[PDB]
């Protein structure tokens, strides 16, 4: 089951957590869902992406692992800034994560990391 970084869409309110995760795995087509494969995890670990995230969240110091993480507006903006200012800020995965963050800001959503 790939790592997800996501928020719900604008007109989706599902409050039960397990059900939100189920929604994300069922809506991988969504612009609000980033699916991240093992090979992406490794590629970006070795380039310092997760370390950049960890500067704000203090998690994933050694990359992602099984678990659930919830990112609030303050941290969403802070991570978004880190990524926009980074050396891979134009690479698709980073753009895709940025986009989830922007959407969550715009639509007042919590961002979930799930693996
Ligand atoms: Mg709305």
Tab-separated table of N, CA, C and O and ligand atoms in Angstrom:
chain	number	residue	atom	x	y	z
A	1	UNK	N	0.842	-1.244	0.000
A	1	UNK	CA	0.000	0.000	0.000
A	1	UNK	C	0.860	1.271	0.000
A	1	UNK	O	1.454	1.583	1.027
A	2	UNK	N	0.929	1.983	-1.142
A	2	UNK	CA	1.842	3.135	-1.287
A	2	UNK	C	1.577	4.200	-0.224
A	2	UNK	O	0.471	4.313	0.270
A	3	UNK	N	2.598	4.975	0.078
A	3	UNK	CA	2.520	6.164	0.938
A	3	UNK	C	1.603	7.181	0.301
A	3	UNK	O	1.708	7.421	-0.895
A	4	UNK	N	0.706	7.767	1.100
A	4	UNK	CA	-0.138	8.839	0.568
A	4	UNK	C	0.128	10.115	1.313
A	4	UNK	O	0.311	10.119	2.531
A	5	UNK	N	0.134	11.215	0.576
A	5	UNK	CA	0.056	12.538	1.223
A	5	UNK	C	-1.188	13.132	0.607
A	5	UNK	O	-1.269	13.215	-0.625
A	6	UNK	N	-2.181	13.492	1.408
A	6	UNK	CA	-3.408	13.949	0.798
A	6	UNK	C	-4.253	14.847	1.702
A	6	UNK	O	-3.988	14.925	2.937
A	7	UNK	N	-5.271	15.463	1.083
A	7	UNK	CA	-6.401	16.018	1.840
A	7	UNK	C	-7.648	15.605	1.107
A	7	UNK	O	-7.583	15.087	-0.014
A	8	UNK	N	-8.796	15.714	1.774
A	8	UNK	CA	-10.050	15.529	1.130
A	8	UNK	C	-10.299	16.656	0.137
A	8	UNK	O	-9.812	17.800	0.308
A	9	UNK	N	-11.091	16.328	-0.861
A	9	UNK	CA	-11.630	17.328	-1.764
A	9	UNK	C	-12.620	18.271	-1.095
A	9	UNK	O	-13.262	17.911	-0.122
A	10	UNK	N	-12.747	19.447	-1.693
A	10	UNK	CA	-13.675	20.495	-1.302
A	10	UNK	C	-15.035	19.937	-0.881
A	10	UNK	O	-15.519	20.228	0.217
A	11	UNK	N	-15.682	19.117	-1.682
A	11	UNK	CA	-17.042	18.840	-1.171
A	11	UNK	C	-17.236	17.437	-0.608
A	11	UNK	O	-18.281	16.826	-0.747
A	12	UNK	N	-16.184	16.969	0.057
A	12	UNK	CA	-16.121	15.683	0.706
A	12	UNK	C	-15.829	16.002	2.171
A	12	UNK	O	-14.804	16.630	2.502
A	13	UNK	N	-16.758	15.608	3.023
A	13	UNK	CA	-16.516	15.573	4.441
A	13	UNK	C	-16.835	14.147	4.880
A	13	UNK	O	-17.952	13.634	4.762
A	14	UNK	N	-15.771	13.496	5.278
A	14	UNK	CA	-15.801	12.178	5.815
A	14	UNK	C	-15.045	12.435	7.097
A	14	UNK	O	-13.943	12.950	7.031
A	15	UNK	N	-15.637	12.170	8.250
A	15	UNK	CA	-14.896	12.431	9.466
A	15	UNK	C	-14.241	11.188	10.073
A	15	UNK	O	-13.247	11.304	10.788
A	16	UNK	N	-14.764	10.007	9.788
A	16	UNK	CA	-14.149	8.837	10.404
A	16	UNK	C	-12.789	8.613	9.734
A	16	UNK	O	-12.692	8.617	8.479
A	17	UNK	N	-11.746	8.495	10.557
A	17	UNK	CA	-10.373	8.509	10.031
A	17	UNK	C	-10.133	7.358	9.063
A	17	UNK	O	-9.591	7.570	7.973
A	18	UNK	N	-10.543	6.144	9.452
A	18	UNK	CA	-10.327	4.961	8.599
A	18	UNK	C	-11.002	5.155	7.251
A	18	UNK	O	-10.419	4.840	6.177
A	19	UNK	N	-12.203	5.713	7.314
A	19	UNK	CA	-12.966	6.059	6.118
A	19	UNK	C	-12.292	7.137	5.247
A	19	UNK	O	-12.455	7.087	4.019
A	20	UNK	N	-11.569	8.094	5.848
A	20	UNK	CA	-10.820	9.110	5.061
A	20	UNK	C	-9.687	8.421	4.317
A	20	UNK	O	-9.397	8.725	3.160
A	21	UNK	N	-9.013	7.499	5.005
A	21	UNK	CA	-7.890	6.762	4.364
A	21	UNK	C	-8.431	5.914	3.210
A	21	UNK	O	-7.839	5.887	2.126
A	22	UNK	N	-9.542	5.231	3.459
A	22	UNK	CA	-10.199	4.453	2.419
A	22	UNK	C	-10.544	5.348	1.231
A	22	UNK	O	-10.273	4.981	0.110
A	23	UNK	N	-11.096	6.532	1.494
A	23	UNK	CA	-11.409	7.501	0.449
A	23	UNK	C	-10.151	7.818	-0.368
A	23	UNK	O	-10.212	7.796	-1.608
A	24	UNK	N	-9.020	8.070	0.300
A	24	UNK	CA	-7.808	8.477	-0.426
A	24	UNK	C	-7.360	7.350	-1.376
A	24	UNK	O	-7.071	7.613	-2.544
A	25	UNK	N	-7.321	6.114	-0.860
A	25	UNK	CA	-6.876	4.971	-1.692
A	25	UNK	C	-7.821	4.718	-2.838
A	25	UNK	O	-7.388	4.218	-3.886
A	26	UNK	N	-9.097	5.067	-2.638
A	26	UNK	CA	-10.115	5.011	-3.712
A	26	UNK	C	-10.150	6.211	-4.655
A	26	UNK	O	-10.867	6.173	-5.663
A	27	UNK	N	-9.424	7.275	-4.323
A	27	UNK	CA	-9.437	8.505	-5.136
A	27	UNK	C	-8.043	8.954	-5.490
A	27	UNK	O	-7.692	10.151	-5.413
A	28	UNK	N	-7.227	7.977	-5.844
A	28	UNK	CA	-5.867	8.292	-6.285
A	28	UNK	C	-5.906	9.193	-7.521
A	28	UNK	O	-4.923	9.869	-7.805
A	29	UNK	N	-7.024	9.259	-8.225
A	29	UNK	CA	-7.047	10.196	-9.368
A	29	UNK	C	-7.101	11.644	-8.887
A	29	UNK	O	-6.806	12.565	-9.650
A	30	UNK	N	-7.521	11.851	-7.620
A	30	UNK	CA	-7.665	13.219	-7.132
A	30	UNK	C	-6.369	14.056	-7.150
A	30	UNK	O	-5.291	13.586	-6.772
A	31	UNK	N	-6.500	15.329	-7.542
A	31	UNK	CA	-5.433	16.298	-7.435
A	31	UNK	C	-5.036	16.502	-5.959
A	31	UNK	O	-3.971	17.043	-5.661
A	32	UNK	N	-5.880	16.035	-5.046
A	32	UNK	CA	-5.631	16.259	-3.596
A	32	UNK	C	-4.882	15.090	-2.982
A	32	UNK	O	-4.620	15.105	-1.781
A	33	UNK	N	-4.545	14.086	-3.806
A	33	UNK	CA	-3.920	12.874	-3.301
A	33	UNK	C	-2.610	12.704	-4.025
A	33	UNK	O	-2.569	12.730	-5.285
A	34	UNK	N	-1.526	12.552	-3.272
A	34	UNK	CA	-0.276	12.170	-3.910
A	34	UNK	C	0.037	10.726	-3.473
A	34	UNK	O	0.175	10.460	-2.297
A	35	UNK	N	0.188	9.820	-4.434
A	35	UNK	CA	0.599	8.457	-4.156
A	35	UNK	C	2.091	8.386	-4.415
A	35	UNK	O	2.554	8.834	-5.469
A	36	UNK	N	2.856	7.816	-3.484
A	36	UNK	CA	4.300	7.860	-3.572
A	36	UNK	C	4.827	6.445	-3.483
A	36	UNK	O	4.604	5.784	-2.486
A	37	UNK	N	5.584	6.011	-4.489
A	37	UNK	CA	5.987	4.620	-4.497
A	37	UNK	C	7.265	4.421	-3.687
A	37	UNK	O	7.968	5.371	-3.374
A	38	UNK	N	7.588	3.166	-3.379
A	38	UNK	CA	8.899	2.865	-2.787
A	38	UNK	C	10.062	3.522	-3.546
A	38	UNK	O	11.003	4.052	-2.928
A	39	UNK	N	10.052	3.445	-4.873
A	39	UNK	CA	11.205	3.956	-5.618
A	39	UNK	C	11.282	5.472	-5.516
A	39	UNK	O	12.355	6.028	-5.472
A	40	UNK	N	10.127	6.130	-5.477
A	40	UNK	CA	10.118	7.574	-5.217
A	40	UNK	C	10.594	7.875	-3.808
A	40	UNK	O	11.256	8.873	-3.596
A	41	UNK	N	10.168	7.074	-2.840
A	41	UNK	CA	10.590	7.313	-1.448
A	41	UNK	C	12.110	7.275	-1.404
A	41	UNK	O	12.759	8.132	-0.803
A	42	UNK	N	12.689	6.279	-2.041
A	42	UNK	CA	14.150	6.120	-1.951
A	42	UNK	C	14.856	7.212	-2.722
A	42	UNK	O	15.787	7.848	-2.230
A	43	UNK	N	14.375	7.479	-3.922
A	43	UNK	CA	14.980	8.523	-4.743
A	43	UNK	C	15.048	9.832	-3.975
A	43	UNK	O	16.077	10.506	-3.916
A	44	UNK	N	13.919	10.221	-3.413
A	44	UNK	CA	13.816	11.479	-2.681
A	44	UNK	C	14.392	11.505	-1.278
A	44	UNK	O	14.801	12.544	-0.817
A	45	UNK	N	14.442	10.370	-0.611
A	45	UNK	CA	15.215	10.254	0.637
A	45	UNK	C	16.658	10.697	0.369
A	45	UNK	O	17.197	11.587	1.036
A	46	UNK	N	17.271	10.073	-0.630
A	46	UNK	CA	18.695	10.306	-0.905
A	46	UNK	C	18.966	11.704	-1.472
A	46	UNK	O	20.094	12.170	-1.518
A	47	UNK	N	17.915	12.404	-1.851
A	47	UNK	CA	18.083	13.788	-2.280
A	47	UNK	C	17.704	14.813	-1.245
A	47	UNK	O	17.849	16.027	-1.454
A	48	UNK	N	17.192	14.319	-0.132
A	48	UNK	CA	16.934	15.170	1.022
A	48	UNK	C	15.525	15.747	1.143
A	48	UNK	O	15.294	16.612	1.986
A	49	UNK	N	14.573	15.232	0.356
A	49	UNK	CA	13.201	15.699	0.418
A	49	UNK	C	12.546	15.478	1.812
A	49	UNK	O	11.890	16.374	2.361
A	50	UNK	N	12.699	14.284	2.387
A	50	UNK	CA	11.982	13.995	3.605
A	50	UNK	C	12.650	14.738	4.736
A	50	UNK	O	11.973	15.253	5.642
A	51	UNK	N	13.970	14.858	4.662
A	51	UNK	CA	14.674	15.712	5.637
A	51	UNK	C	14.162	17.167	5.623
A	51	UNK	O	14.036	17.818	6.660
A	52	UNK	N	13.844	17.687	4.451
A	52	UNK	CA	13.290	19.019	4.347
A	52	UNK	C	11.968	19.100	5.052
A	52	UNK	O	11.718	20.085	5.757
A	53	UNK	N	11.105	18.097	4.835
A	53	UNK	CA	9.822	18.018	5.504
A	53	UNK	C	10.028	17.920	7.016
A	53	UNK	O	9.378	18.633	7.792
A	54	UNK	N	11.002	17.110	7.420
A	54	UNK	CA	11.259	16.854	8.834
A	54	UNK	C	11.693	18.121	9.580
A	54	UNK	O	11.548	18.210	10.809
A	55	UNK	N	12.239	19.093	8.858
A	55	UNK	CA	12.635	20.374	9.475
A	55	UNK	C	11.454	21.104	10.091
A	55	UNK	O	11.644	21.839	11.043
A	56	UNK	N	10.247	20.904	9.544
A	56	UNK	CA	9.035	21.456	10.088
A	56	UNK	C	8.325	20.464	11.000
A	56	UNK	O	7.863	20.836	12.055
A	57	UNK	N	8.211	19.192	10.603
A	57	UNK	CA	7.312	18.286	11.324
A	57	UNK	C	8.022	17.535	12.430
A	57	UNK	O	7.401	16.962	13.329
A	58	UNK	N	9.329	17.494	12.324
A	58	UNK	CA	10.189	16.706	13.211
A	58	UNK	C	9.926	15.232	13.153
A	58	UNK	O	10.212	14.506	14.101
A	59	UNK	N	9.353	14.795	12.047
A	59	UNK	CA	9.105	13.389	11.816
A	59	UNK	C	9.799	13.029	10.513
A	59	UNK	O	10.218	13.930	9.788
A	60	UNK	N	9.876	11.722	10.193
A	60	UNK	CA	10.539	11.236	8.975
A	60	UNK	C	11.987	11.720	8.846
A	60	UNK	O	12.450	12.060	7.751
A	61	UNK	N	12.681	11.800	9.974
A	61	UNK	CA	14.086	12.205	9.952
A	61	UNK	C	14.881	11.226	9.062
A	61	UNK	O	15.853	11.616	8.404
A	62	UNK	N	14.450	9.965	9.071
A	62	UNK	CA	15.058	8.939	8.214
A	62	UNK	C	14.129	8.462	7.119
A	62	UNK	O	14.267	7.345	6.618
A	63	UNK	N	13.189	9.320	6.754
A	63	UNK	CA	12.223	8.984	5.745
A	63	UNK	C	10.951	8.416	6.332
A	63	UNK	O	10.842	8.207	7.525
A	64	UNK	N	9.967	8.181	5.478
A	64	UNK	CA	8.674	7.711	5.899
A	64	UNK	C	8.737	6.262	6.383
A	64	UNK	O	9.693	5.506	6.091
A	65	UNK	N	7.765	5.912	7.209
A	65	UNK	CA	7.599	4.570	7.700
A	65	UNK	C	6.098	4.378	7.908
A	65	UNK	O	5.332	5.321	7.725
A	66	UNK	N	5.667	3.188	8.331
A	66	UNK	CA	4.259	2.956	8.567
A	66	UNK	C	3.767	3.894	9.682
A	66	UNK	O	4.430	4.047	10.723
A	67	UNK	N	2.618	4.517	9.461
A	67	UNK	CA	2.045	5.415	10.469
A	67	UNK	C	1.114	6.446	9.871
A	67	UNK	O	0.767	6.368	8.692
A	68	UNK	N	0.662	7.388	10.698
A	68	UNK	CA	-0.279	8.393	10.235
A	68	UNK	C	0.133	9.693	10.834
A	68	UNK	O	0.464	9.732	12.029
A	69	UNK	N	0.096	10.752	10.026
A	69	UNK	CA	0.607	12.042	10.461
A	69	UNK	C	-0.360	13.079	9.941
A	69	UNK	O	-0.906	12.940	8.837
A	70	UNK	N	-0.638	14.080	10.750
A	70	UNK	CA	-1.672	15.056	10.359
A	70	UNK	C	-1.024	16.380	10.458
A	70	UNK	O	-0.456	16.655	11.506
A	71	UNK	N	-1.153	17.221	9.419
A	71	UNK	CA	-0.356	18.463	9.264
A	71	UNK	C	-1.407	19.575	9.316
A	71	UNK	O	-2.390	19.521	8.578
A	72	UNK	N	-1.234	20.526	10.243
A	72	UNK	CA	-2.164	21.624	10.409
A	72	UNK	C	-1.755	22.815	9.520
A	72	UNK	O	-0.622	22.853	9.032
A	73	UNK	N	-2.640	23.797	9.375
A	73	UNK	CA	-2.362	24.953	8.495
A	73	UNK	C	-0.975	25.575	8.709
A	73	UNK	O	-0.258	25.824	7.760
A	74	UNK	N	-0.604	25.849	9.958
A	74	UNK	CA	0.719	26.427	10.223
A	74	UNK	C	1.840	25.606	9.585
A	74	UNK	O	2.719	26.142	8.914
A	75	UNK	N	1.807	24.295	9.834
A	75	UNK	CA	2.834	23.415	9.315
A	75	UNK	C	2.703	23.246	7.784
A	75	UNK	O	3.732	23.132	7.093
A	76	UNK	N	1.478	23.228	7.286
A	76	UNK	CA	1.233	23.141	5.817
A	76	UNK	C	1.958	24.281	5.093
A	76	UNK	O	2.675	24.065	4.103
A	77	UNK	N	1.772	25.499	5.606
A	77	UNK	CA	2.398	26.663	5.008
A	77	UNK	C	3.895	26.584	5.132
A	77	UNK	O	4.593	26.912	4.197
A	78	UNK	N	4.390	26.182	6.301
A	78	UNK	CA	5.842	26.078	6.540
A	78	UNK	C	6.494	25.019	5.611
A	78	UNK	O	7.572	25.245	5.083
A	79	UNK	N	5.848	23.868	5.447
A	79	UNK	CA	6.402	22.828	4.559
A	79	UNK	C	6.341	23.319	3.128
A	79	UNK	O	7.312	23.148	2.349
A	80	UNK	N	5.227	23.955	2.769
A	80	UNK	CA	5.068	24.465	1.415
A	80	UNK	C	6.188	25.439	1.047
A	80	UNK	O	6.739	25.382	-0.059
A	81	UNK	N	6.508	26.347	1.983
A	81	UNK	CA	7.611	27.283	1.789
A	81	UNK	C	8.923	26.541	1.576
A	81	UNK	O	9.648	26.897	0.645
A	82	UNK	N	9.229	25.556	2.431
A	82	UNK	CA	10.474	24.758	2.346
A	82	UNK	C	10.575	24.140	0.939
A	82	UNK	O	11.627	24.165	0.279
A	83	UNK	N	9.471	23.564	0.488
A	83	UNK	CA	9.523	22.904	-0.823
A	83	UNK	C	9.661	23.879	-1.995
A	83	UNK	O	10.370	23.586	-2.954
A	84	UNK	N	8.917	24.980	-1.942
A	84	UNK	CA	8.955	26.004	-3.006
A	84	UNK	C	10.345	26.617	-3.142
A	84	UNK	O	10.748	26.991	-4.228
A	85	UNK	N	11.076	26.680	-2.027
A	85	UNK	CA	12.427	27.238	-2.019
A	85	UNK	C	13.542	26.229	-2.212
A	85	UNK	O	14.712	26.622	-2.201
A	86	UNK	N	13.189	24.961	-2.448
A	86	UNK	CA	14.151	23.867	-2.492
A	86	UNK	C	14.799	23.713	-3.851
A	86	UNK	O	14.358	24.320	-4.825
A	87	UNK	N	15.809	22.844	-3.911
A	87	UNK	CA	16.549	22.560	-5.146
A	87	UNK	C	15.783	21.651	-6.113
A	87	UNK	O	16.172	21.517	-7.254
A	88	UNK	N	14.683	21.058	-5.665
A	88	UNK	CA	13.859	20.219	-6.574
A	88	UNK	C	12.440	20.770	-6.626
A	88	UNK	O	11.481	20.033	-6.820
A	89	UNK	N	12.297	22.084	-6.447
A	89	UNK	CA	10.975	22.661	-6.316
A	89	UNK	C	10.174	22.560	-7.617
A	89	UNK	O	8.979	22.833	-7.623
A	90	UNK	N	10.831	22.215	-8.726
A	90	UNK	CA	10.110	22.060	-9.967
A	90	UNK	C	9.908	20.622	-10.371
A	90	UNK	O	9.344	20.356	-11.435
A	91	UNK	N	10.312	19.674	-9.534
A	91	UNK	CA	10.223	18.295	-9.962
A	91	UNK	C	8.808	17.807	-9.685
A	91	UNK	O	8.154	18.294	-8.773
A	92	UNK	N	8.287	16.917	-10.544
A	92	UNK	CA	6.849	16.602	-10.426
A	92	UNK	C	6.417	16.188	-9.056
A	92	UNK	O	5.402	16.683	-8.604
A	93	UNK	N	7.123	15.275	-8.384
A	93	UNK	CA	6.615	14.849	-7.075
A	93	UNK	C	6.517	16.037	-6.108
A	93	UNK	O	5.558	16.149	-5.322
A	94	UNK	N	7.525	16.907	-6.131
A	94	UNK	CA	7.533	18.043	-5.233
A	94	UNK	C	6.400	18.982	-5.611
A	94	UNK	O	5.711	19.476	-4.732
A	95	UNK	N	6.174	19.210	-6.928
A	95	UNK	CA	5.053	20.008	-7.359
A	95	UNK	C	3.728	19.415	-6.903
A	95	UNK	O	2.807	20.150	-6.545
A	96	UNK	N	3.630	18.094	-6.981
A	96	UNK	CA	2.415	17.444	-6.609
A	96	UNK	C	2.138	17.601	-5.104
A	96	UNK	O	0.985	17.767	-4.710
A	97	UNK	N	3.191	17.506	-4.299
A	97	UNK	CA	3.009	17.655	-2.839
A	97	UNK	C	2.632	19.098	-2.579
A	97	UNK	O	1.644	19.375	-1.884
A	98	UNK	N	3.334	20.014	-3.242
A	98	UNK	CA	2.997	21.446	-3.098
A	98	UNK	C	1.527	21.715	-3.414
A	98	UNK	O	0.829	22.500	-2.723
A	99	UNK	N	1.033	21.040	-4.444
A	99	UNK	CA	-0.324	21.300	-4.853
A	99	UNK	C	-1.346	20.870	-3.805
A	99	UNK	O	-2.382	21.547	-3.607
A	100	UNK	N	-1.110	19.695	-3.208
A	100	UNK	CA	-1.973	19.253	-2.093
A	100	UNK	C	-1.957	20.268	-0.981
A	100	UNK	O	-2.998	20.624	-0.447
A	101	UNK	N	-0.783	20.760	-0.662
A	101	UNK	CA	-0.654	21.774	0.392
A	101	UNK	C	-1.454	23.051	0.044
A	101	UNK	O	-2.253	23.551	0.845
A	102	UNK	N	-1.283	23.552	-1.166
A	102	UNK	CA	-2.061	24.732	-1.602
A	102	UNK	C	-3.555	24.501	-1.539
A	102	UNK	O	-4.322	25.387	-1.087
A	103	UNK	N	-3.996	23.322	-1.973
A	103	UNK	CA	-5.397	23.032	-2.004
A	103	UNK	C	-5.924	23.037	-0.556
A	103	UNK	O	-7.067	23.468	-0.283
A	104	UNK	N	-5.144	22.480	0.343
A	104	UNK	CA	-5.591	22.319	1.740
A	104	UNK	C	-5.664	23.691	2.367
A	104	UNK	O	-6.542	23.943	3.177
A	105	UNK	N	-4.705	24.544	2.025
A	105	UNK	CA	-4.767	25.945	2.493
A	105	UNK	C	-6.019	26.586	1.968
A	105	UNK	O	-6.813	27.140	2.749
A	106	UNK	N	-6.229	26.495	0.650
A	106	UNK	CA	-7.373	27.148	0.039
A	106	UNK	C	-8.719	26.620	0.513
A	106	UNK	O	-9.701	27.375	0.591
A	107	UNK	N	-8.783	25.336	0.826
A	107	UNK	CA	-10.066	24.739	1.152
A	107	UNK	C	-10.199	24.311	2.615
A	107	UNK	O	-11.111	23.566	2.939
A	108	UNK	N	-9.277	24.782	3.435
A	108	UNK	CA	-9.262	24.627	4.894
A	108	UNK	C	-9.340	23.154	5.301
A	108	UNK	O	-10.272	22.734	5.987
A	109	UNK	N	-8.384	22.371	4.821
A	109	UNK	CA	-8.393	20.906	5.053
A	109	UNK	C	-7.129	20.557	5.850
A	109	UNK	O	-6.075	21.212	5.749
A	110	UNK	N	-7.204	19.497	6.655
A	110	UNK	CA	-5.988	18.947	7.253
A	110	UNK	C	-5.329	18.085	6.193
A	110	UNK	O	-5.989	17.523	5.357
A	111	UNK	N	-4.025	18.100	6.192
A	111	UNK	CA	-3.249	17.230	5.292
A	111	UNK	C	-2.849	15.979	6.048
A	111	UNK	O	-2.368	16.071	7.171
A	112	UNK	N	-3.049	14.812	5.452
A	112	UNK	CA	-2.642	13.548	6.087
A	112	UNK	C	-1.466	12.923	5.360
A	112	UNK	O	-1.424	12.931	4.113
A	113	UNK	N	-0.504	12.416	6.127
A	113	UNK	CA	0.472	11.514	5.538
A	113	UNK	C	0.097	10.133	6.058
A	113	UNK	O	0.019	9.944	7.265
A	114	UNK	N	-0.096	9.175	5.171
A	114	UNK	CA	-0.484	7.806	5.623
A	114	UNK	C	0.383	6.750	4.940
A	114	UNK	O	0.571	6.814	3.739
A	115	UNK	N	0.897	5.789	5.706
A	115	UNK	CA	1.691	4.708	5.103
A	115	UNK	C	1.453	3.490	5.981
A	115	UNK	O	1.258	3.571	7.214
B	1	LIG	MG1	-15.436	24.125	0.869
